[PDB]
């Protein structure tokens, strides 16, 4: 098989910065008809791939002119003259000259931006779910950067462990931020044994930790 | 300028799966129709292609004995079947042709029976307000396999929506939330309905999310 080696594995860039991705094949990609079948793809986070360039250098319709493809033989390059926010995701090269067709390993492009504090929200469990014998409490941290965030649950001011799950979104393609959810899950009986449910959030964008809480009766 | 793939599937070990890719906005018979397997760690693996112009197929030697590729020129639809499914066959499968890629078909090889989700509201209140905006959403809990799709107001509402990646619960069932931020002033006049579709259990659920009084 013809191996496609992409470098670097990760690009961390700021808005406006040039970027460059190298793709080298283990054999020539020149085909017998005189063309070189080397393609470039971008798969934005949570999206299907999209072809940007074919035949080494030819841009697809709708692709901005800040993308350029070059190279020949075994060595190929995709360059972004000035990175924009929507250029994030994973770039792949792949060759259509040899059998089997083969893909590069991928280059993750991620955006460095200013620190932005999360907005913090909390949701008490619904009456419908409490009727079924379970209480999920959700803590939402919205539109922050950087990704690292400390979320701790406190129940009657006692720190919780072992009963919550976190999920983080992909980086946003417009503002380059993240959101996070932390879900505290208890049975109906355990939920009704306590009064103050609180999520406490620490993040570089906050001058001091932020607590969001409710009382089991109030809501 | 568009490739539309069929919905996600739950399939048993040793059975087969057949998925479709409908093409539009380009000459279907003029380009090789490729099929690509995406591994969990961002890898892309070529399965093979069919050229709908003459039916000729070429395969990756790893898939030769189990992938069958066909094309219907009258309906501009390509098909892939994969027989003798094993655990390593659980993946997202893409079709690709010309400048276009499909959205992918998620295949789950498992002997467990399917379960449709329960949907619960994430009610907005003063405890989910910040800077004059309010957060709200729906909790989508206890389903198998992936994925569920969530839309809001039948797809009319997309701005500010975060549908989180699902988590795996220790029961083996999945769970996710979808949230949105909106004006806090609008909570009495606007209606926010989340639409949760789960293809493998044929579950469609709409849950109107009302505010709470606190």
């Amino acid at each position: 098989d013809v191996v496609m080696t992409q470098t670097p594995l990760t690009l961390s860039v700021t808005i406006g910065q040039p970027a460059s991705i190298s793709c080298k094949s283990s054999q020539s990609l020149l085909y017998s008809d005189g063309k070189t079948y080397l393609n470039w793809l971008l798969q934005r986070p949570g999206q299907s791939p999209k072809r940007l360039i074919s035949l080494v250098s030819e841009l697809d319709s709708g692709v901005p002119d800040r993308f350029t493809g070059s190279g020949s033989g075994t060595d190929f390059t995709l360059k972004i003259s000035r990175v924009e926010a929507e250029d994030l995701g994973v770039y792949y090269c792949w060759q259509g000259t040899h059998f089997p067709r083969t893909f590069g390993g991928g280059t993750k492009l991620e955006i460095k931006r200013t620190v932005a504090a999360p907005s913090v929200f909390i949701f008490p469990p619904s009456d419908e779910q409490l009727k079924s014998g379970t209480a999920s409490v959700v803590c939402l941290l919205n539109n922050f950067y950087p990704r690292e965030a400390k979320v701790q649950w406190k129940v009657d001011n006692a720190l919780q462990s072992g009963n919550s799950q976190e999920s983080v979104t992909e980086q946003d393609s417009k503002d380059s931020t993240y959101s996070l959810s932390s879900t505290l899950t208890l049975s109906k009986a355990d939920y009704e044994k306590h009064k103050v449910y609180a999520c406490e959030v620490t993040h570089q964008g906050l001058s001091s930790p932020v607590t969001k809480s409710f009382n089991r009766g109030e809501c | 300028a568009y490739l539309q793939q069929s919905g996600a599937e739950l399939v048993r070990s040793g059975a087969s799966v057949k998925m479709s890719c409908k093409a539009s906005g380009y000459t279907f018979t003029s380009y090789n129709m490729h099929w690509v397997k995406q591994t969990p760690g961002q890898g892309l693996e070529w399965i093979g292609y069919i050229y709908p112009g003459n039916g000729v197929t070429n395969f990756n030697q790893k898939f030769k004995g189990k992938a069958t590729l066909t094309a219907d020129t009258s309906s501009s639809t390509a098909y892939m079947q994969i027989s003798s499914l094993t655990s390593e066959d659980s993946a997202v499968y893409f079709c690709a042709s010309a400048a276009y890629w499909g959205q992918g078909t998620l295949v789950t090889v498992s002997s467990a029976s399917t379960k449709g989700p329960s949907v619960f509201p994430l009610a907005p209140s003063s405890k989910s307000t910040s800077g004059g905006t309010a957060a709200l959403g729906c909790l989508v809990k206890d389903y198998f396999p992936e994925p569920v799709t969530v839309s809001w107001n039948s797809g009319a509402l997309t701005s500010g929506v975060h549908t989180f990646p699902a988590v795996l619960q220790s029961s083996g069932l999945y769970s996710l939330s979808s949230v949105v931020t909106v004006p806090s002033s609008s909570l009495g006049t606007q209606t926010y309905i989340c639409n949760v579709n789960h293809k493998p259990s044929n579950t469609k659920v709409d849950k109107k999310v009302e505010p709470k009084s606190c």
């Binding site: 063309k35 079948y37 072809r51 030819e58 697809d60 319709s61 259509g96 | 380009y31 050229y51 400048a99």
Partner: peptide, 15 residues
């Protein structure tokens, strides 16, 4: 619009 470039050459007709 112009037709997009191919990713790879189509195979010749079998017979």
């Amino acid at each position: 619009p112009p037709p997009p470039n191919p990713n790879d050459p189509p195979p010749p007709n079998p017979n």
